[PDB]
Write an enzyme that holds these catalytic residues in place. Structure first.
Site, mmCIF file in Angstrom:
data_model
loop_
_atom_site.group_PDB
_atom_site.id
_atom_site.type_symbol
_atom_site.label_atom_id
_atom_site.label_comp_id
_atom_site.label_asym_id
_atom_site.label_seq_id
_atom_site.Cartn_x
_atom_site.Cartn_y
_atom_site.Cartn_z
ATOM 1 N N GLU A 17 -14.819 3.085 -0.419
ATOM 2 C CA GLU A 17 -15.376 3.800 -1.559
ATOM 3 C C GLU A 17 -14.272 4.174 -2.544
ATOM 4 O OE1 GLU A 17 -17.775 7.098 -0.046
ATOM 5 O OE2 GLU A 17 -18.495 5.722 1.506
ATOM 6 N N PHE A 18 -13.094 4.474 -2.006
ATOM 7 C CA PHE A 18 -11.942 4.874 -2.811
ATOM 8 C C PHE A 18 -11.539 3.804 -3.822
ATOM 9 C CE2 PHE A 18 -8.833 2.117 -0.801
ATOM 10 C CZ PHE A 18 -9.411 1.851 0.423
ATOM 11 N N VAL A 21 -7.154 -2.179 -1.394
ATOM 12 C CA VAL A 21 -5.750 -2.413 -1.060
ATOM 13 C C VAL A 21 -5.426 -3.881 -1.307
ATOM 14 C CG1 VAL A 21 -3.924 -2.279 0.699
ATOM 15 C CG2 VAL A 21 -5.884 -0.632 0.747
ATOM 16 N N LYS A 36 -2.394 0.161 -2.507
ATOM 17 C CA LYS A 36 -3.723 0.743 -2.544
ATOM 18 C C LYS A 36 -3.996 1.292 -3.933
ATOM 19 C CE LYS A 36 -4.206 3.981 0.358
ATOM 20 N NZ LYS A 36 -4.503 4.600 1.674
ATOM 21 N N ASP A 134 -5.158 11.595 12.118
ATOM 22 C CA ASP A 134 -6.124 10.507 12.035
ATOM 23 C C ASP A 134 -5.615 9.262 12.754
ATOM 24 O OD1 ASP A 134 -8.579 9.406 11.309
ATOM 25 O OD2 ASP A 134 -7.806 8.595 9.422
ATOM 26 N N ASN A 139 -5.371 2.661 11.735
ATOM 27 C CA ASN A 139 -4.274 3.326 11.032
ATOM 28 C C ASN A 139 -2.919 3.051 11.682
ATOM 29 O OD1 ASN A 139 -6.109 4.407 9.237
ATOM 30 N ND2 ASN A 139 -6.199 6.410 10.236
ATOM 31 N N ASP A 153 -1.513 5.262 6.763
ATOM 32 C CA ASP A 153 -2.641 6.041 6.262
ATOM 33 C C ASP A 153 -2.437 7.522 6.561
ATOM 34 O OD1 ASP A 153 -3.972 3.829 5.183
ATOM 35 O OD2 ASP A 153 -4.899 3.339 7.104
HETATM 36 C C1 LIG Z 1 -1.496 0.913 1.298
HETATM 37 C C2 LIG Z 1 -2.538 1.271 2.070
HETATM 38 C C3 LIG Z 1 -2.458 1.490 3.508
HETATM 39 N N1 LIG Z 1 -1.941 0.274 4.080
HETATM 40 C C4 LIG Z 1 -0.614 0.105 4.299
HETATM 41 O O1 LIG Z 1 0.284 0.947 4.078
HETATM 42 C C5 LIG Z 1 -0.437 -1.166 4.819
HETATM 43 C C6 LIG Z 1 0.644 -1.935 5.260
HETATM 44 N N2 LIG Z 1 0.392 -3.194 5.727
HETATM 45 C C7 LIG Z 1 -0.863 -3.727 5.782
HETATM 46 N N3 LIG Z 1 -1.052 -5.007 6.263
HETATM 47 C C8 LIG Z 1 -2.245 -5.690 6.312
HETATM 48 C C9 LIG Z 1 -3.551 -5.121 6.339
HETATM 49 C C10 LIG Z 1 -4.693 -5.933 6.405
HETATM 50 C C11 LIG Z 1 -4.576 -7.342 6.456
HETATM 51 N N4 LIG Z 1 -5.702 -8.131 6.526
HETATM 52 C C12 LIG Z 1 -6.858 -7.632 7.241
HETATM 53 C C13 LIG Z 1 -7.639 -8.808 7.865
HETATM 54 N N5 LIG Z 1 -8.142 -9.693 6.775
HETATM 55 C C14 LIG Z 1 -8.937 -10.843 7.291
HETATM 56 C C15 LIG Z 1 -7.060 -10.106 5.821
HETATM 57 C C16 LIG Z 1 -5.659 -9.538 6.182
HETATM 58 C C17 LIG Z 1 -3.283 -7.912 6.435
HETATM 59 C C18 LIG Z 1 -2.137 -7.099 6.369
HETATM 60 N N6 LIG Z 1 -1.891 -2.960 5.347
HETATM 61 C C19 LIG Z 1 -1.699 -1.712 4.878
HETATM 62 N N7 LIG Z 1 -2.593 -0.829 4.408
HETATM 63 C C20 LIG Z 1 -3.934 -1.095 4.385
HETATM 64 C C21 LIG Z 1 -4.517 -2.366 4.174
HETATM 65 C C22 LIG Z 1 -5.919 -2.488 4.212
HETATM 66 C C23 LIG Z 1 -6.725 -1.362 4.475
HETATM 67 C C24 LIG Z 1 -6.106 -0.112 4.699
HETATM 68 C C25 LIG Z 1 -6.832 1.152 4.983
HETATM 69 O O2 LIG Z 1 -7.883 0.947 5.926
HETATM 70 C C26 LIG Z 1 -7.397 1.785 3.687
HETATM 71 F F1 LIG Z 1 -8.056 2.965 3.952
HETATM 72 F F2 LIG Z 1 -6.377 2.054 2.803
HETATM 73 F F3 LIG Z 1 -8.258 0.921 3.057
HETATM 74 N N8 LIG Z 1 -4.756 -0.054 4.651
#
Ligand SMILES: C=CCn1c(=O)c2cnc(Nc3ccc(N4CCN(C)CC4)cc3)nc2n1-c1cccc([C@H](O)C(F)(F)F)n1
Ligand SMILES: [Cl-]
Length: 261
Positions: A17-18, A21, A36, A134, A139, A153
């Site tokens: 909703e926010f 990323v 994000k 959390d 996370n 997070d």
């Molecule tokens: C900046 C926001 C927080 N944050 C990080 O600091 C951070 C660091 N590294 C990654 N790597 C990362 C995530 C996801 C994927 N995917 C998922 C599977 N998909 C099929 C494709 C590849 C690949 C590499 N991700 C991160 N963050 C992140 C990414 C997505 C969602 C949320 C939290 O749930 C949300 F609340 F911020 F949305 N956080």
């Protein structure tokens, strides 16, 4: 926009909703970051607290091998942006969801590694008189080259001795916190970590309420479909003890004999 100017979008890797990323490359250094981008919350509101907790958390934390690194944050065009480290292995939730889709698991060796590493992150955070509040697999983020687990997070991070508590995911929440007892919050992180490892170990989906929920808070471990050492099992057991004072501190956790290595 600074966003467009400093970065090129590659892939949407998260949403809510926010906002979203994005996996981005910073034009100036050629490095990958997770950015994000969210709509600016109502000034004063709970979400403005969340957004503020996240930045003021870094203001105290800085850099650590088992906390997702923050690089910058800014607001423009009625949105807020936060630039974090990109962990190429996604979250522990992705890794678990990929274990299930594809018929895999985590060995005891790997569960211990997960527990110790996030433990080291918690040790640090608590030492800075903060609590994450959390902890859950979604996370916990993963960097590969060979794996590093990093706590991210930080939107619920708050003080040990002056806690503003926005209560975390019901599935991972200790009973005392629900009871508005905020006097041992570091032990709520410990409780949530235990159930995080339980999820990684292949337990069936945690309850959000009902008798199964209460049985867990009574100190009963969810059923783990693989054979773990009794020693390791007992550690996870004590980590969800109904008496938070009986749970190990992050320090005791990282110093624990069963976690040597
Ligand atoms: C900046 C926001 C927080 N944050 C990080 O600091 C951070 C660091 N590294 C990654 N790597 C990362 C995530 C996801 C994927 N995917 C998922 C599977 N998909 C099929 C494709 C590849 C690949 C590499 N991700 C991160 N963050 C992140 C990414 C997505 C969602 C949320 C939290 O749930 C949300 F609340 F911020 F949305 N956080
Ligand atoms: Cl679910």
């Amino acid at each position: 926009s600074r966003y467009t100017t400093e970065f090129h979008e590659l892939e949407k890797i998260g949403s809510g909703e926010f906002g979203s990323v994005f996996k981005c490359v910073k034009r100036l250094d050629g490095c990958i970051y997770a950015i994000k981008r969210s709509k600016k919350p109502l000034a004063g509101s709970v979400d403005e607290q969340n957004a503020l907790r996240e930045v003021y958390a870094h203001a105290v934390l800085g850099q650590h091998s088992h906390v997702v690194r923050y690089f910058s944050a800014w607001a423009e065009d009625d949105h807020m942006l936060i630039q974090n480290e990109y962990c190429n292995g996604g979250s522990l939730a992705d890794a678990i969801s990929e274990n299930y889709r594809i018929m895999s698991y985590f060995k005891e060796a790997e569960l211990k590694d997960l527990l110790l590493q996030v433990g080291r992150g918690l040790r640090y955070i608590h030492s800075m008189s903060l609590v994450h509040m959390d902890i859950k697999p979604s996370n916990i983020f993963i960097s590969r080259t060979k794996v590093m687990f990093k706590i991210g997070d930080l939107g619920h991070v708050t003080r040990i001795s002056s806690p503003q508590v926005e209560e975390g995911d019901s599935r991972f929440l200790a009973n005392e916190v629900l009871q508005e007892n905020y006097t041992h919050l570091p032990k709520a992180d410990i409780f949530a970590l235990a159930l995080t490892v339980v999820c990684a170990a292949g337990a069936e989906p945690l309850p959000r309420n009902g008798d199964q929920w209460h049985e867990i808070r009574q100190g009963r471990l969810p059923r783990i479909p693989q054979v773990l050492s009794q020693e390791f099992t007992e550690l996870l057991k004590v980590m969800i003890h109904p008496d938070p004072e009986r749970r190990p501190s992050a320090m005791a956790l990282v110093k624990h004999s069963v976690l040597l290595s």
